[PDB]
Amino acid sequence: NELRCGCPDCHCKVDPERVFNHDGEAYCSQACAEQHPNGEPCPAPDCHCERSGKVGGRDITNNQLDEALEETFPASDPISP
Ligand SMILES: [Cd+2]
Ligand SMILES: [Cd+2]
Ligand SMILES: [Cd+2]
Ligand SMILES: [Cd+2]
């Protein structure tokens, strides 16, 4: 039932109670979750992952975001909890 880190170059135990997800993937920490965007390694002192793959400088981190409205506030408001 242990979760596994998405970083192949990383050696960490991902707890099912503290798994950092990214796009549906499991990671040891949010550090690896972003696949080292600033070359920042995971928060493990014995681990040395940062030059994984061909990451040079940064990655293409751009969100398409959500455009399913912004809760339009009209005069007649729906039932509030
Ligand atoms: Cd690591
Ligand atoms: Cd790690
Ligand atoms: Cd990791
Ligand atoms: Cd890593």
Side-chain angles (χ1 to χ4, degrees), residues 27-48:
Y27 291 94
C28 69
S29 184
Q30 198 167 330
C32 268
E34 303 204 279
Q35 308 173 271
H36 309 280
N38 281 206
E40 189 175 0
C42 69
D46 282 76
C47 197
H48 296 257

Side-chain angles (χ1 to χ4, degrees), residues 37-76:
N38 281 206
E40 189 175 0
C42 69
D46 282 76
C47 197
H48 296 257
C49 59
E50 54 203 285
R51 56 170 170 178
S52 188
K54 292 171 59 187
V55 179
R58 65 177 301 207
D59 200 282
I60 306 298
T61 313
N62 294 89
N63 289 148
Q64 292 293 270
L65 300 172
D66 176 273
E67 295 188 78
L69 300 169
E70 51 172 278
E71 284 188 283
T72 52
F73 289 92
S76 307

